Amino acid sequence: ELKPTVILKLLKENIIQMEMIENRTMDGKPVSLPLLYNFNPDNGFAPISEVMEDRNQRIKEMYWKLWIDEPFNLDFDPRDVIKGKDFEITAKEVYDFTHAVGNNCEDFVSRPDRTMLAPMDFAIVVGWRAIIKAIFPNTVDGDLLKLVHLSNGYKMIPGAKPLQVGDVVSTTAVIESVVNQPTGKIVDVVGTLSRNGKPVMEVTSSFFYRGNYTDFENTFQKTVEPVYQMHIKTSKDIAVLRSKEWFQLDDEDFDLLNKTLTFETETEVTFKNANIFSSVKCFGPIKVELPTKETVEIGIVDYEAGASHGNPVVDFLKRNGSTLEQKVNLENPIPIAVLDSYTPSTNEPYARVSGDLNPIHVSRHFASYANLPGTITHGMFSSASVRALIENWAADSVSSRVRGYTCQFVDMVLPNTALKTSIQHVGMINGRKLIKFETRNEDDVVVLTGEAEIEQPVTTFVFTGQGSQEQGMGMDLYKTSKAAQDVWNRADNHFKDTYGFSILDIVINNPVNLTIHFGGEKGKRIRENYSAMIFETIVDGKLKTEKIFKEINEHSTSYTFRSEKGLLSATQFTQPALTLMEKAAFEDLKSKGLIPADATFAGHSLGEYAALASLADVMSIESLVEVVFYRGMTMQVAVPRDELGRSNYGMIAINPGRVAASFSQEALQYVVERVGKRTGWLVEIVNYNVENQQYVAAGDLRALDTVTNVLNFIKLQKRGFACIPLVGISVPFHSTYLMNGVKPFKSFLKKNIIKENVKVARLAGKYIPNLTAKPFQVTKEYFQDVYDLTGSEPIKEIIDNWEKYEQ
Amino acid sequence: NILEWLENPSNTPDKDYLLSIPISCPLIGVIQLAHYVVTAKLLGFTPGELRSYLKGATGHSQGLVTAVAIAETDSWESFFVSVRKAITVLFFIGVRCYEAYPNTSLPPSILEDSLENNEGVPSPMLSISNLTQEQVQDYVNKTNSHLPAGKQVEISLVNGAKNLVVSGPPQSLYGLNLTLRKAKAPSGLDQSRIPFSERKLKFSNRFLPVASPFHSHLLVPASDLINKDLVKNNVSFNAKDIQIPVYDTFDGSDLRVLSGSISERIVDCIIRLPVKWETTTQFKATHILDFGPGGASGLGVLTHRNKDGTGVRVIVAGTLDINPDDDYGFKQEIFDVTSNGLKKNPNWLEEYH
Amino acid sequence: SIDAISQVINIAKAHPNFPIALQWTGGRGGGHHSFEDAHTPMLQMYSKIRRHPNIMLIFGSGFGSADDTYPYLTGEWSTKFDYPPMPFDGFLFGSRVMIAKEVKTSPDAKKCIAACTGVPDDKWEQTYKKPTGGIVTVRSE
Amino acid sequence: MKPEVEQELAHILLTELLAYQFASPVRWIETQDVFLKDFNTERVVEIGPSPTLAGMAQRTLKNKYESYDAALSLHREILCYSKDAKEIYYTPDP
Ligand SMILES: Cc1cc2nc3c(=O)[nH]c(=O)nc-3n(C[C@H](O)[C@H](O)[C@H](O)COP(=O)(O)O)c2cc1C
């Protein structure tokens, strides 16, 4: 229909009023912006001038009527926090929004047996009122008709679920920074959407008031600096750091020497003019890296200054430290897709769903008055449309996979325009894919850019156990990767200093024999290390402290490790080497941002120990290789041996589906159980690997030899036929033979496993132990299962006294 | 604005929007009514006379509405009344069935996987040929055991002994397709030297050009809406008004003897119950006129293949063409005045008795 | 096989007036035999064959009496497969006459033949592996 | 329970599990079940010098989850660090 858009009259005898009317309001009542002009007949060349006093106030009053449903009041503090009204998400609203922005993800479409999610872009619908109320205050003065939306961003808070229909959301908004620039005034706003009292996501919106501003007393800025790292090498560095007045450590006697420090600071500044600051405040915590790679706060950065030309703290950290960057670029971008998209023919539906009733998108006269190329489409519509594209393609239409999305509006877009967006996988960040996109219009002009953070597909990391340890394992990564080098070098240094041998040497060269020489002071210290270690055991409920290396006494000048074809096969050297290979590989993966934060993990035999060090970081590298070497040596002395390091026991892999197509596991578990019972020796099943296809038995190498023969006789009626020998094993691992050690082993681990180095959040629901094939949980049911299978007294002390601990 | 689209092909919406059921249901009804009109007009007959020449009528899913509406016609004045009834029913079927289960984008990985294996674009209806109903039901059960209740699939169209169609969510049908291609031999496999009993069964599958799971549990919630709407729109079919047998698509029974509302039964058959085409077609007739869309790829050719060797002739009234095999007629055969207008298909039991 | 039947149809089409006797036999016949079922290829190709009036349809491979051929003469055989009746034009009997008085089979050979019991059609395929009904399958040169 | 008491209990549990693991059988069957069905997993990454557990998981999938994987449309990916570097690091060759 036809309605009055503009009226022109004489509001006075000398004042012309042009009342520009917007009809598409929230209430349906039209809103008028009165533009006032002076008519001066004396100046015949230009009799009409514009009345500037309060023009910005009139424009803001119009936009307040259009956008904010609260009483008009422009006198509130920008430094304060704006609180938004509670929002109830409904299926109708999600439907309307998704249809307006052209998002056809099934997660948002109502379906039976599935609650419907709301799209990430719905956060603007939720928090637009609070976000846009930030640019109104009279201290942040500007022409709203020249307001430009520079960029918008969404950021899911880690561990927060996506919005869903039925949620009640609360919005809070604060201005992060408002600074005057020569081309105008930038206002950066941060909104926080909270569900049930917990925050869900953060919205960052950057606005631009084009013009010339010099009211620097109203301006301020806040920047989260990149984290800076410093390796304190020499006493010179300590002295210089202690000279800086801002560098404050709580423990004045802390030893910075050979320590890695990280500084994470924030700078709050006010301005006196374009070039100079009127106040500078840099602050934050100082943290120190630990042997377990966990950083702990040791002090606070604290710099406060008045008039200044810069921040000295950031300059010092830039020049002396290095900046840690979370994002890690792939060596080559991986193209995902190039897609076609189109702008709607009317901007009204998006305005109505989003509440963004800016006239420039719908009203021709307002857009002409603003000198725009037309009724430009909302930038936020374009952002939502491109995010729908990215979600469909980059995230394979799995909505929850998209955790972050930021866009920059580099140019305006008119309705009925063909857009072409190109999507690329460029890097990783904290286990999430980094997607860049760039949208061009028909003229081939970039109109929109941004990035996205897509979570990886659900992942499980699985760590291999003892097996065929090959010469040179992990050495290519050792040559190329810096994290691998760190792991291997720390371990090799510890081994050289403590036991006079290099594990790297054993991996690289695999010597048949290795002699340790106890000459000199260092030799004597190494000999003492060898002498100390023991193999405690429980006999009939009594400790029996043996000594490993009975040949080594205070008159020994050397000791020789022996083998047949190479010591890399020996247990004490194979276990630490495999642990290091796996830890190094995982550290390299972590250093490239490839480890999902929710990745569950497990390890097969030895792998379990390595997996905990890699994902849980329960012990430092030096402790890890130390305990594995102690355990490996214990195994050598658990079984009687001979020269070249051999044993009477052994292990074989069994394929029950090879003796007969109808030989169930419970049948094999029956035969082996009886064979040992019907023969009085030790033999059992140690590894259930593949259903009815892979079982490993451990025991006497003679007894195992009968087991294969018997099954070979079973397979004759209704290597080996069904029993291949697992090379590299020389002890009955996972057998009741080793039950005595479990007591000393527990004491040795309870010693070495530091109480404070175990983070439940790193284990709960992620770690699946081999003892109980159930994800780790600190619950009575878990401890009950542990006690059930393998009775342990401390466990049931936890059980029987649970009420005491739970409270 | 169908008139605008017909006038200017350049400004006709794209194929996918046309194919959406709220469009294609009434449009296909209109196509069928228009073909019925041309036949009558050319034969210098009124709709009532042409219907009186028919021993009976029936339809394949959506076509049942057109069948009953045609059975309603009496003269050129009441023909528009019947047409309004039919297209009203179809329009509301399309609208409510699209509202109940609207189509949503499929992950592009699945699209790529389906294309790379000589398979079509997934849709809510899968056509499986050269397999018994028991085998297809076996595969359907296997697939459905792993799926929740709301995503289960089912057989919708029992077109023939070896011709079946499964309706359900495109994702579930894709999973079923994965199972099927894990159990299908390559077409270019030679088994002439292998014993027949041990031969690996060969078959084919493809996705139909449709955009809704007809005859499926998913559209069940729309039945009450459709029934409640038709009573308001003043659409109803009376058994007295129908004057030729119209066969129900579930049991092939005559709709005129139905005790309840014929419109309710028609909508139930379209959206919920499966089509047992062989059961519906058990009538005895010499000639069958196919007005439905598809031409040589329509329901007439399927019915001809089902009924081969029983002395039944199929004429596809919708298209003009020449059949080299000459086993079924085209539009011309309906109007030919020579003997060429009367062609009898072979009845083996009688010819080679 | 099916392709052979198509070739026969093409021959008959090239000479529409010349009579062609399509002697169809399954893999269950005596002597040299194939791997084909006796019924499925006919159920597939009967219509195509009857498109051509000059083809005469003979059925063989497994017949020895009027009782077991009459269903094929009347076409009632194909109804068990849920098909319309498909009558045939004639039958051939190879094995059935090998113990006829005028054949040159040796008397002990005739007794050996008669002593074979044979097997029903659903089990004829069990000659590729072991004797069944006194008959087995072996490979030629 | 309090975070400190929770950490104490977790430490006790972890020490007990590690202590008893080497003297009790390794239930890789239940673990493969857990992380292939109870969590599902589109990528299983084996950290080791050879594809042992990768082969184990591939066999388990082939023998216990063909129909379930097909029905639920999972594009599972079994990768071993030793042989599958490109897919682990997203470095496909040009
Ligand atoms: C002993 C014997 C010899 C045969 N020799 C030939 C032959 O030389 N050429 C040929 O085309 N078919 C030959 N056949 C196949 C027959 O012509 C006929 O197809 C077959 O015997 C019919 O199957 P039936 O034995 O079950 O009755 C022979 C069959 C038998 C039993």
PDB file of C-alpha atoms and ligand atoms in Angstrom, chain C residues 25 28-32 60-63 92-96 98, ligand 1:
ATOM      1  CA  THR C  25      17.308 -77.276 -22.298  1.00  0.00           C
ATOM      2  CA  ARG C  28      20.002 -80.707 -15.750  1.00  0.00           C
ATOM      3  CA  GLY C  29      20.180 -82.602 -19.053  1.00  0.00           C
ATOM      4  CA  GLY C  30      22.419 -85.514 -19.884  1.00  0.00           C
ATOM      5  CA  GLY C  31      25.813 -85.296 -21.514  1.00  0.00           C
ATOM      6  CA  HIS C  32      27.313 -81.893 -22.175  1.00  0.00           C
ATOM      7  CA  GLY C  60      13.826 -80.592 -22.821  1.00  0.00           C
ATOM      8  CA  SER C  61      16.383 -81.562 -20.150  1.00  0.00           C
ATOM      9  CA  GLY C  62      14.637 -83.683 -17.595  1.00  0.00           C
ATOM     10  CA  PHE C  63      11.466 -85.172 -19.050  1.00  0.00           C
ATOM     11  CA  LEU C  92      12.650 -83.589 -26.483  1.00  0.00           C
ATOM     12  CA  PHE C  93      13.678 -86.739 -24.598  1.00  0.00           C
ATOM     13  CA  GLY C  94      17.388 -87.548 -24.650  1.00  0.00           C
ATOM     14  CA  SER C  95      18.145 -89.739 -21.640  1.00  0.00           C
ATOM     15  CA  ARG C  96      14.703 -91.351 -21.519  1.00  0.00           C
ATOM     16  CA  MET C  98      18.853 -94.697 -23.914  1.00  0.00           C
TER      17      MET C  98
HETATM   18  C1  LIG E   1      24.221 -89.692 -24.201  1.00  0.00           C
HETATM   19  C2  LIG E   1      23.885 -88.308 -24.668  1.00  0.00           C
HETATM   20  C3  LIG E   1      24.538 -87.805 -25.777  1.00  0.00           C
HETATM   21  C4  LIG E   1      24.254 -86.530 -26.232  1.00  0.00           C
HETATM   22  N1  LIG E   1      24.910 -86.059 -27.339  1.00  0.00           N
HETATM   23  C5  LIG E   1      24.634 -84.802 -27.810  1.00  0.00           C
HETATM   24  C6  LIG E   1      25.300 -84.329 -28.924  1.00  0.00           C
HETATM   25  O1  LIG E   1      26.129 -85.040 -29.483  1.00  0.00           O
HETATM   26  N2  LIG E   1      25.033 -83.073 -29.419  1.00  0.00           N
HETATM   27  C7  LIG E   1      24.105 -82.287 -28.778  1.00  0.00           C
HETATM   28  O2  LIG E   1      23.866 -81.163 -29.207  1.00  0.00           O
HETATM   29  N3  LIG E   1      23.438 -82.752 -27.669  1.00  0.00           N
HETATM   30  C8  LIG E   1      23.695 -84.009 -27.175  1.00  0.00           C
HETATM   31  N4  LIG E   1      23.027 -84.473 -26.062  1.00  0.00           N
HETATM   32  C9  LIG E   1      22.013 -83.592 -25.388  1.00  0.00           C
HETATM   33  C10 LIG E   1      20.614 -83.958 -25.867  1.00  0.00           C
HETATM   34  O3  LIG E   1      20.467 -83.548 -27.202  1.00  0.00           O
HETATM   35  C11 LIG E   1      19.517 -83.290 -25.045  1.00  0.00           C
HETATM   36  O4  LIG E   1      19.723 -81.898 -25.008  1.00  0.00           O
HETATM   37  C12 LIG E   1      19.475 -83.817 -23.622  1.00  0.00           C
HETATM   38  O5  LIG E   1      19.773 -85.191 -23.612  1.00  0.00           O
HETATM   39  C13 LIG E   1      18.101 -83.593 -23.015  1.00  0.00           C
HETATM   40  O6  LIG E   1      18.198 -83.713 -21.625  1.00  0.00           O
HETATM   41  P1  LIG E   1      17.763 -85.059 -20.878  1.00  0.00           P
HETATM   42  O7  LIG E   1      18.888 -86.039 -21.050  1.00  0.00           O
HETATM   43  O8  LIG E   1      17.579 -84.759 -19.417  1.00  0.00           O
HETATM   44  O9  LIG E   1      16.499 -85.633 -21.452  1.00  0.00           O
HETATM   45  C14 LIG E   1      23.307 -85.742 -25.588  1.00  0.00           C
HETATM   46  C15 LIG E   1      22.652 -86.253 -24.475  1.00  0.00           C
HETATM   47  C16 LIG E   1      22.941 -87.524 -24.012  1.00  0.00           C
HETATM   48  C17 LIG E   1      22.210 -88.034 -22.807  1.00  0.00           C
END
